[PDB]
Amino acid sequence: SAQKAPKWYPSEDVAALKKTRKAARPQKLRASLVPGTVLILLAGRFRGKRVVYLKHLEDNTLLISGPFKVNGVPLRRVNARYVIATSTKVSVEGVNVEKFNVEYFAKEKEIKAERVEDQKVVDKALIAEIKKTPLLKQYLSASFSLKNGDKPHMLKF
């Protein structure tokens, strides 16, 4: 014997977790985000882009278009905390949005012909509305940027 054997040793039984009480409640959203509201993406691939909020999804993200034919952004999840909500909005009355949901984006490359139509569908409603108020196409077509003197605790958006 090198070391002497312990008098005890513990149990290798894993212990059961205590029963936790935390409900998962629905997420309150910032008053500023009402579907149809243009958005500013602050991070990620598409940062700098000006987009259009579509639906609050149930994984807590935000449905988005912008739409593709203008700024190149497809129908997309985005996180509410990485967005600035600008005070300009488009009328969303004519957009379906019902099909689009959590498992729609479920990870199952070649872009599924399903999606490629859906964008043509959804954006066909948007642009027709975006066309209704002058220069809005140019607006969503541009990228947001901070310029010398811009103070975000002042600037209204």
């Binding site: 014997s1 090198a2 070391q3 054997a5 040793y9 513990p10 290798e12 894993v14």
Partner: protein
């Protein structure tokens, strides 16, 4: 492969080297408490070396656990190894330095077959 345990928190990783063992070679770093009357270390003036005291003691739950999570057990032979058969998810086996290379292939073989972790495999091991 081991009991889950909370994050190990070491609380002081540095070594508590004896005062001035940096200064005079004759002074070994093995910690020694300064008994002197004026000693700035003993009186704890700001800027000096921090001394070992009990507040630094490890959490009774994460104490003695190696980074793996196995409190390790010294094993000189296959009989020693086999003390760990039931406690495989608790302890770990450390072959003694003096065990020859033959019994190391032997102890490793039983430890594998028994499902016991050897802390120091690749021990005296050729090629």
């Amino acid at each position: 492969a081991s009991l889950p345990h909370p994050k190990i928190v070491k609380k002081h990783t540095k070594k508590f080297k004896r005062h001035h063992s940096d200064r005079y070679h004759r002074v070994a770093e093995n910690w020694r408490k300064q008994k002197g009357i004026d000693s700035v270390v003993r009186r704890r003036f700001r800027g000096n070396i921090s001394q070992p005291k009990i507040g630094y003691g490890s959490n009774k739950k994460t104490k003695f656990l190696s980074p793996s999570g196995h409190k390790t057990f010294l094993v000189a032979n296959v009989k020693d190894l086999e003390t760990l058969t039931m406690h495989t998810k608790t302890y770990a086996a450390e072959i003694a330095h003096n065990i020859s290379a033959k019994n190391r292939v032997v102890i490793l073989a039983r430890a594998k077959a028994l499902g016991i972790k050897v802390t120091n495999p690749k021990g005296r091991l050729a090629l």
